[PDB]
Structures are given as structure tokens and as C-alpha cells.
Amino acid sequence: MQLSWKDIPTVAPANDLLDIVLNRTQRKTPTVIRPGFKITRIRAFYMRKVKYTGEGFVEKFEDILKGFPNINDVHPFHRDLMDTLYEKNHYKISLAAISRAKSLVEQVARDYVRLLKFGQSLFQCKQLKRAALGRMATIVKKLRDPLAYLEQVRQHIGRLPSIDPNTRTLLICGYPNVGKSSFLRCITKSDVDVQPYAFTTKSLYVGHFDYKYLRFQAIDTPGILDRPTEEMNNIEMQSIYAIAHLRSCVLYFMDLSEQCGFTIEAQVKLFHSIKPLFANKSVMVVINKTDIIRPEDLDEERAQLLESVKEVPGVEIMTSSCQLEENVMEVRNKACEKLLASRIENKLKSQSRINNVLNKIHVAQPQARDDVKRTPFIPESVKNLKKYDPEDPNRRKLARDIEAENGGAGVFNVNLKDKYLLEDDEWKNDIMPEILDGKNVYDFLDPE
Amino acid sequence: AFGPKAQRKRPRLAASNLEDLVKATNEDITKYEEKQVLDATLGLMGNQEDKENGWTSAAKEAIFSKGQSKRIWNELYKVIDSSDVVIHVLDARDPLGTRCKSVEEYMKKETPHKHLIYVLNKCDLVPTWVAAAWVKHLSKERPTLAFHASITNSFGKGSLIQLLRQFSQLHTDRKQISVGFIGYPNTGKSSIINTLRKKKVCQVAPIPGETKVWQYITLMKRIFLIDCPGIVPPSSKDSEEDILFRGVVRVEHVTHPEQYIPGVLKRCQVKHLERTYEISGWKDATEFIEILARKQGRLLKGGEPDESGVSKQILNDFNRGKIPWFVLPPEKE
Amino acid sequence: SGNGAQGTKFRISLGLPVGAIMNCADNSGARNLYIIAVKGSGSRLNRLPAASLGDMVMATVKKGKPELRKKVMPAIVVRQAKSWRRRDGVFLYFEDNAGVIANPKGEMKGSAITGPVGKECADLWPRVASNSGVVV
Amino acid sequence: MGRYSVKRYKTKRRTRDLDLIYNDLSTKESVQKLLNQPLDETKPGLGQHYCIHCAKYMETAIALKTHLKGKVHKRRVKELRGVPYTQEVSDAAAGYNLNKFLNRVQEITQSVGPEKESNEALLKEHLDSTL
Amino acid sequence: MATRTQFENSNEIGVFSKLTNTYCLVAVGGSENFYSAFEAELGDAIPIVHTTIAGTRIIGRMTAGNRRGLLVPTQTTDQELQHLRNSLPDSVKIQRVEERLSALGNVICCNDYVALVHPDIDRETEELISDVLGVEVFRQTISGNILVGSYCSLSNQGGLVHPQTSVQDQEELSSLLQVPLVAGTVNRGSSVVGAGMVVNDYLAVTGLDTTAPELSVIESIFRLQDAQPESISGNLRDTLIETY
């Protein structure tokens, strides 16, 4: 999988592409031909014109065709997302139009070079070359609509978030205005907008975090309305496909204060309606906005509704408030634990990754072999050393600080003799002689 | 459909319900996983793993693209445009390997009035039942004649001549007919023409590509024969090993023939190889090459065996018919 | 000085032009390497690209594993027979030309290098230094 | 300088040095490893029929016998009879590491000398018996 | 007590540095950022010495030692040897060794008590190791891998071997070294762990590209933080299963 498609070159519109390719021919090929030249030279001149223009068009079309993803060969989550966003039928039809234009341009170039082989005069050769280029221009101008569509699609698809469907995922779902973007802001550093009106978020947003040295992604979705898929719209279909495809831990958010504009009965009904969506995935129901109302001081009928939500195996109810750091961290950790348990238990049922995992998990241990004492050695100065604080008024000045205050890196000349541990500190800047009368001083230098 | 002026807010073909939707998603995920396993058993184990190591395959040699030249195919289309009867010459050892299906389809589509027939040459290099079975199976599509081309001691010459006379009699109002010989290099087109003329009128050599331009030969007053250079139609399934073992390329211009010697071992019987080279006891191609080199005295300086030269000689023997081999014909029905 | 190299590289006398055969010093299974290109080599009319000690080349295997053959791979020159000058003040040379198979990042395919490795190459390529048993 | 010397003693046409051959001949285990080798196509005679003194592979047993019954091998053996001439000899000649050179000299005279001579005698009688 | 740094945008810390319990050696090349990365963790508690070995920067690969001694190859110059002697206190012996295998850091893997060595080192080099470094010496390969110094990272508390080491080899080496051993990687999948990191009893320095699970494995096996024993592999088993 690729997960990102920002490296698609710019798609020019039809007239711009025509201008680019034709002017490239006029600039990069020679333009002066004389009627008094040899007919072979004239024919070569115009054949080169036709072949070069065809090659330019084919190069542009090939850059278009290689850049765009193959929608039927990507992961099915990406296929469904791109079908919702760009209408896969139109997408494939436009790219097929590009392919057909490439084939037709190649055919025109070959046919008119073969025809130019038999040109008898400069006028006839010029007419044939102009005919070839005009037919190429007609073919290219037939592509005016697919090129506009593909340029818009390229710009939009370069900005999609990179979602790995085979990593660890916390999905966030529910009605609008229940706190989904607020929770994503709390747990990640995604900049998803938080506003007190419905459908502020119209697309999938991704954040990341680390739990037990493991990278987790978190998907915040647009809200879903309690409607059948027949009258569901594309914005909600993004969330539907996210929940259907991404194997994950789903967090269904409920606002019991009814500040979201939806009743608790409606939220329970939506949960029971999208119950078939999250099967064999981890499920948890998070009650947001506990600083306004709480499950414990609700009504009896509403408590019965929440119990009916809890009835579905094997979901669990947890309270949270997007102004409560400890509680949002706790619910994040519980969801991560459920997801990790599911993944590890699934891998426990497999036999492929067993022996290597055991080898890389086993810690070898020694046993006796002698009555010799071997203990770690930590110097007293080391264990009395104070921790270095980069942001502190009274901190030890480092060698890089001295370098920067003297000359900076690559200009500062360190004196390596300043660290010498000698009997006399006046001996530090002493030049040690090396040669005396054809003898190395060092192999004579010896005590006694 | 999409853009600033888009009016598509709902999917066109909505699913029935969430249960059908999740069933479809599970089916798609399973199909994707199975497809990934099937494609990664080959591609990711092969080409894509080399991209991590910065490795690139050796550049394809120009000797394997011989027979796909513009001059050669210009000659081919010239002789087809000039011919009334076209004789497609196949090798009796590998006729399906030596069939030019694209040229056959072009002839049956664009020029249906030209009569395409099969001549299965080099039938003396295969067992008689193999030649009979191949003739029977190819006769289900085209009139096929078994042949052994030789100026002095041939087979099938009278049958070919009487077939050509029948074609002339059918076209008795054309004042002459032309019979163009096409096929792979080294199938024996020039040898068949020499056999029909009972005289060496076209140059013949074991090396491929001896014939370069077309040649007119007057067989009878109303029958002309056209000699054409051999053609190798381009393809992607035809590997360099297949092309080399069809006798297409000149072996002296290949890089590492020791890499192709295992193909000889797979295509030849052990008893036939051991009878041809009077050696035995090898367990792989490298040991076979080394044993043959030491027996034949093909030593480099200091006593090292000349593996490349011995391998080239083995490939030449295989292609030129000093080692017996054939491809099994289709099973009898 | 090539991707993966550690720092700059002073000029060494060029010993191996394109088309030369050097030995393979690693334990990857190859026996010799045939130089087809020199990384970082400039362009001049009629002048052959040429490698010296510490350079990265693109090479093919002539003798060795049939799996390893018929592929173009990066290699790093670790010994050269053409004498070169050290800034400590001596000209020196090895008895043979030898390189080691590597990836584009200068990491070794093999795990050990047999024979001495030049100081210049070992200092330029940390993985060569890590897999060297003898650095001059 | 001249063509003969250049094309014989070129850098790429080098042969094994006398001190290396002395170290190969010093111990019986080295003699055994050099005499008993796996069959290797890259060496003449499949790595068999190898003269340790000349450090040279012959193609056949009769070729090795003829080489041994010749003056070239005798010249090599007489060259190897003496001190192997390490760098310590040149240092001592300059007056450098003299005690180290004297220690090496007495070790050669006492330990490594007679054992190498006995190994040479055993190798010679083995070659005579097997040839 | 495991930090991450680079020497001029390179992850191979052990190539350019040497860390023992009583001193540290750093290559002189470039700025003072590498020296200050070591100095922020060590202070003026132990000597940190800029050095060159035969004019090269590969000092961890060219040198070997422990808290009691330092061995340098025969290619070291007298001036470099004198600079090392003047910078280091008399409690650490310094010896230049005439050895065919000059990359002493590659061919010798040692701590204060034991030393695995290349199986083809000289007997006098072995005796010099046992004398200057004051350790037991064993000739070993790490699952068939010579250059034990580059393919092992060792301290007095534990050891990290290259991940292709079998469990039986790990058991034999653990019984020889009298420390726990784990197989793992450093610098995002590199097998050359001894040349990827430097470690002593209270500090580890790895490359910047080392990941969180690798850092956790390193901290656990070398027992760096007080609340980090060597048997918390049972607690990190989930993350290790996920990562592997």
C-alpha cells in the first residue's frame, strides 16, 4: 500500500497542454527549412517535427497515467473512500480517455511519418506535417473535460490523510456535536476544528499518539445520522466505510446533556442501528460532557436505555469529559488495551510467527561457573553528578557553548592540551620534541 | 461529479443495508488479502526485494532482439504483398515454438486471398510418430506437409511440387504465381528452396540470419519462389532462454551461456547427452560443463576449464542438431 | 562523495577505470567484480570514468554465486594497487584491487571483510570500518 | 625497469613470500591443512599436488615428482633454510629493538628451528612414499 | 539512562566513540556537538578525550578497553599515544599492541571482567588482554559471526547481541559472560549493535534513529534506570510482539 498520492504532476487543461507541447516543438526543434534544399533534408525536417510533437503528447499522457492510483488495486478502504469522494466511474472513464488519446496520438504520428516518406515537395511535406499536428490538436482538445476533472481530483487527492488500515486504530464516531473533534484534540496534536454546530468536520481526520512504545492512529469522522444507506449522503458514507473497513477499537460518543441537539433515545437508536457495522472489532461507549450531566443522576428510563446499550456484547461504558485530562487518558488507555488484547489474541491463534518471536523474546541467563564477584562499577563523581538542565540559569557551560561564544562551529580552534593531567599545570602548553640528530626522541624517552 | 460545481451528494447505487454493506466489505477484504498473497509469492520475492538492495538486472543484450529489425520486417511485408501462396516453415522439433501466430492472423484478416500452408521441416531429426502426430494436429487448422530439406537426399519434394502445381492450376489465369517462404530464422527456408530447385541457389548456413534480402527463384515457367529472411515476432512471454533454444540468436554474442546450460539439461534426455559426449556422473550443469571441458581438453591457462566456450559449443550442438531432442506433441484424442 | 559516505574525500590517485576487474573482499559469495560505472564521476570528452580507494562503483559479478550474477550492484573499493599519497607523508599501495558489495546507503551485504582495508575507505564508510578486521 | 623484470615482478603477478612460507612450514597442523585440501576447480590439479616451499600447484603427481627432482625446488629450500627476515632484522641492523631481535633469534634457534626441520623431513618422506 | 545522538548526522555511535566505566573517547572531527552530547550526561565526572587513531575518526572500531586499561593498535602514532597518556589518569593503563587484526574494537568485545575475542588473534595478544584489561578471555563467534566487538555490545549488567543469534548460542555466551543477553537491533533495524551504540554500567548512547521499542529493550537489558530491571521483558512482551 502507498497511503499517499501527493506526487502526481500538475495536469494542464486542454488549451494549456496544446500550447505547451506545440511551443516546445517550435522551440526545441530547428525551424528554418528552405525549398532549395534536398528533398531528403526537407522530409527529415518535417518527420522530426511530427515525431517530436507526438512524443511530447505521449510523455504528458504517460505522466498522467502513471501518477494516479489504480482504484481497483488499492486497499478496499482506499477504494471505497476514493469512490465516495470522486465517483470511481468518472475517475476510470477519464483515465481511459487519456489512454485512448495516447494511443490515437501515437497512431497519427506513425501514419504521417510513413506518409511523409513519399513527399515530393516542400509544400506537400509542410501540408502533411500541419495535418498531423492539427489532428493531434483535435484529439487533445477532445480531452477538455477529463483534464479539468483530473486536475481537481489531483489537487484534492494530494491532501488526503495517510491512513494505514493494518496498524492500530482508535475510531471515533457518533452524532454531530458530541465531542469527537474535542477528544481527538485532547489525545493527539491534530488541528481538527471544534465548533458548536453540526458537521464542522466533513472528512476523516487522523491523529497519532504513543502507548507502551507503540504508535497508534486515531480517526475522527463526520457525524452519522440515523438514516438508511439509501438516503445516506457521501459525507456520512466516509464514516460508514471507515467503521466497516478499519479493524480497530470504536469509541461511540454520547452526549447525555442533549446539548448536541439529539435525544438520548436517538443516540441509543443510532448505536443499535450501526451495531452491525462494528462486528469482531473492539467496541466502547464513551459518555462525553460529564461536567454538565452524569449517568448516575439521569432518569430511570434513560438509565434503562443506557443499560440496553450495555447489553450488546461485549461493549463497555466509560465516562469522559474533554476538559478532564485524566479521564480522557484513562479512556484512551482502556481502548488501547482492548485493541492490543484483540490483536495479540488473534496472533496467538497463528503458527507462523512463533519460533522467531520466542527467540527474540527469550532472555538468556547465566549460572554460577565460579565463585567470582562481578558487580557494576559506578564512580562516586558520577553518582554525585547533578542532572543537566538545558533551561536553567546556573548550568554547566558545555564545549559547544564555549565554541559558539568563541567562534562557532568550524571556526573555533579547541586546545586539546587543556585537559592534560600533569604534575605541573605550566607544562600543559609544552611542545614535546620528536627528532634529534636523526633519532626519534620517543624511543629514548623512558624513566630511570 | 466532482469539483466546486459538484451536485453529487449521495452515492448512485446505495447498498441495501448495513448487513449487506459489511458482508461486501468483508468479501472485498478477503479477496484483497488472497490477491496480495498470490502476487507477493512471486513479485515481492523477486523484483521488488532487489529495489531495497539497490540492485538492477543486467541490460538486455542486442543479440536477442535480432529478427525484430525494421529492415527484416520490411522485407517480410514485401514478400507477403508479392506472394500468392505463403509457406510457413516450422521446425519439427518445436513447431508451436516456431509458429508466427501474429503474422498468420494478419494474413487471415487483411489478405484472405493468399493461401497459407504449413511445411514441417527437419522431420529427420524427430521420431516418425512425432512427425505424424504433429502433421495430424496441424492439419486441423492448415494443410501441413512433412519435409526433410536436402539437395541430394530429401523427403517430401514431390509432394510439395505437386501441391504447387495444384495451386498454379487453380490460379491458371494469373500467368504466374509466387510462393513466399516465411518463418523463424534457421528453420530451413533456403534449404527447402534449394531442395525444390535441386541446386544451391540460396545461401544456406547454420548461423541465423544468413538470408538478409528477398530473392526470386524461377521453379517452373509459371511458378516463382520467394526467399525471405527469418522473422521473430515480439512478445513478452518469450523469454531469452526460449528464444535461444529456438535457434534464433548467435551463441558467440551471448554473455553467460552457463546460465542457459541447465535449459539444455531440462530439454535433453540424460542418456542422449551421455551418448553424445561419452561422459557420465554429473549431478548439475556446472559439473556437466566441467566434466566435458576436462574430457575435451578445453583448458584455460593454468588448467582452468573453459566453461564459456564449452557452453557455447553445447548450445551450438543443441541448435544445429548434434544432440537429439524434441518437444512432445499433444496427446492423442 | 556519494550517498551514505561520512564527510568529504580528498583526492586519491585513480587506479580502476571502467571495465576493470577487482577481487571481492567480503563473504557474500562473489569472487570478483567488474566495474561498469563510477559514482560521482565527472564528465569530460574521451575520459573514462575511474575509481580509486574509497569510491562507490556500480559493478557486476563475473565469478561467484549464479544467484548473485547478472545484476548490477553497488560496491565500495577497499584496496587498490595503484600507489597513492597519504598526507602523513608516504606513497603506498596494495598488491591487489578489491571491493565489497554494498547497498546505496553504504551498508554491507556481507558480514566480514578478508584482508586489509585502507584507512581512507574505512574512515569514509562506517559500515566498512565496522566489518573490517584489519584497517591497514 | 626493463621489460623482463616488469612483466615478471609486476604487482598483480606476485607470489607468496618467504616468511609466509616459513610460517606455513613451521607447524605440522599447517602442513596437514596444506596437504589435505578440498577439491577446488580454481586451482590447478583440483588443489592437489601443491609444493609448499615453492607455494605452487602442479597439475599431476608426475609433474610434482619432476618438480621435486629439480634445482628450482632445491634453490627455494636453500632460501628457506635461513632466518625468515622479518622487519625486526632490519630494525636490529639499524640498531632498533635489538633485545626483541635477540629474543626472536634465540626462539628461532631453540623452538621453531628443529620443529620446522622435523616437519620438513616428515613432509619429504611422505612425498617420497606417496610418489 | 539511554540517550540518542549523532556524530555528524550518523547513527554509528560506537564507530566514533568509546565508552567505559571510567573514561570516554570521542573523535575530533567537526564541531563540539558530539563532545557536548557526551558531556551533558557525564559532566566532569570522568575524562572525555578527543582523540585520533592513525589520523582516523574510527576510534571505537580501532580501540578496545575497559575501566582498567586501554589497548591501541600498532598503527597508532607516538604523539597520539602520548596525548592519550596525558589526558587519562594513571589508574588506566595504556598499551600499544602489535596485532595483525588492527581493528581491536571490532575483534575484541569486553567488559571489566570477561572478554570475547576473535578466534584468530595471537596468543601474545591474548596474554596482553588478560594482563592490561585484567579479564578472562574466550575465543568465540556470535552465531558464526567473527568481529564480536562489532556484533556485540557488552557491559557488566547485560549484553545485546545481533538478532540472528540462536537461543543455544545465547545461552552459551551468557554462561561465558555471566550476564543476561538479549538479541535485538539498534538504529532502526541494524544488526551491527556493537558499532551502533556505546554502553557502560550507568549510561547508554545510541543513534537518533533508534526506535522506542529498541530503546526500551536496551534500557531493560542494560539496567539503566533504577525502576528498570532486566526481567521486564515479560512486561514489554506485548510491545515486542507488536513490533516484531
Place this chain on the structure above:
Amino acid sequence: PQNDYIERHIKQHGKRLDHEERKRKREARESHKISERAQKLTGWKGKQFAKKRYAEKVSMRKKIKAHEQSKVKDALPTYLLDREQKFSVPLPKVRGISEEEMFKVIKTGKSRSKSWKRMITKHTFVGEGFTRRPVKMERIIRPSALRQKKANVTHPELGVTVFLPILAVKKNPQSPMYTQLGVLTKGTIIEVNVSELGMVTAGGKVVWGKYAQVTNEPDRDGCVNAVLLV
């Protein structure tokens, strides 16, 4: 960044402090810039600039006309609405083409001393079952690249053009020799298959062959264009 991050950044942080004034002054300068371009651009760029200016002025005039026209204020069946679409020949006289222009001398021999071969330089129709004559007796050469099988035929009624297969060359106006050689030049009467036009006689017979006249020079434009004779 993800989704419409630049739009969100403008919504959250604004633009550069001088953005509006800078854009306003650039738009004010545009008139001087246009005049300077028109008087300063040379060569191909100047010609293209003038052409584009004329097109823009025409389009603006059309838009003004449409606005003012809006401000001033075939009998098809139900299943077809909301669905869109003498005996003198049209070319009684065409340019005469000599044998010198029509044919090209092809020299043969090692020293190129024999010049009996001729090559037709125009497009030809050879018909079904064409086989090249033996080269020893091939005087007139019609190269295969110049052979034609189909033509763009336009029906004067209903205003459509169809790619139709050619059946025969009825009359080349230059010469009956060019007629029998099948030369396709301007004014040539050809027979074309009109099966896809769906023509039926008053007696009920389906018409699948009619006459057309070539209206172009195929040797100049690479294709045969013809008008049906109805």
C-alpha cells in the same frame, strides 16, 4: 497537513498584513501592464498576445449582447425531442495533373542506368484481392503506404459524415488511365458502401452502393474526403 489546511490556516491566522492592498494595486497596474505587453512583446509572443486579446474582446462583446438580449424581454415526436442530431457534380472542373507530377522515375541497375519503372506519387485504391506483380515485370508501382480503403463521406441531406469503405474508382477526371490505375485525386468519382446510411429504394431494395466525389487532395492531407451524390 490534511484536507483544506491552507483554507483553515487563512481562517485561523488570516493573510499577510498587506495582502489586500498589494492585490488591489496589482489589479490597478494591470491596465498599464496590458498596454506595455502589447507594445513590447515581439515575435511569436506578440502575435499570440494580440490573437488572445482579439478573442477576449469578441467574447466580452458576446456576453454584453447576451445580457442585453435577456434584458430586452421541425415537428419531432415525443420520443425524439430532447434528443439532438440538373445532374451536375459539385466539382465539374479541377486542377489538371500531368504525368510528370503523377509519376516518379525509379532508376534500376548498379549504376542506375535503367529508368523504365514508374511510381505513382498519389493515393490509390487497389481493390480486393490485390497481389503485387513480380518485381521483374512491375513497371507501375503503387506503394502500400499510399493505398486507401475508406473515405470520410458527407451526405448533403441531414448533414452527417461517415467513414465508409470504398468499393471502386468510377472515374478519375484526369485520364481513364488514372481511372484504371485507381488514382484518388480531387474530383474523382468513387463508389462507396452506404449500408450504414439506411437508404431504401421506392421499390423496397436496400441501397448499399452509391457514388461520391472526392473533394480534397489526399496526397496533401493524408485522408480521402468525399461528398455523396444524392
Place this chain on the structure above:
RNA sequence: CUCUUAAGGUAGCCAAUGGAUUAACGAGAUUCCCACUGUCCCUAUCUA
């Protein structure tokens, strides 16, 4: 009036051989390999 596709499991019948895929020879024409090298990288120096 009629004609061709009966042949079958890695070498057959029928008459040592089933051949010109002809040894040897050649200032005949051509391809490749080892060796070798100032042909070349890239030129320098010496003699008459």
C-alpha cells in the same frame, strides 16, 4: 466418381552405413574466447 488428419509414450521400420552438417589443406571471406599489450584513459621520455 474420388483424393488430405489411418501412424503415438525420447528413437522406428526398411535396405557397417543411411551420408553434402564431407576429413585434410588455404597469404580466400566472417564471428567469438584465452593470452597479450601505449589501441585507448593520457600522454611522457630516450637513440640515430
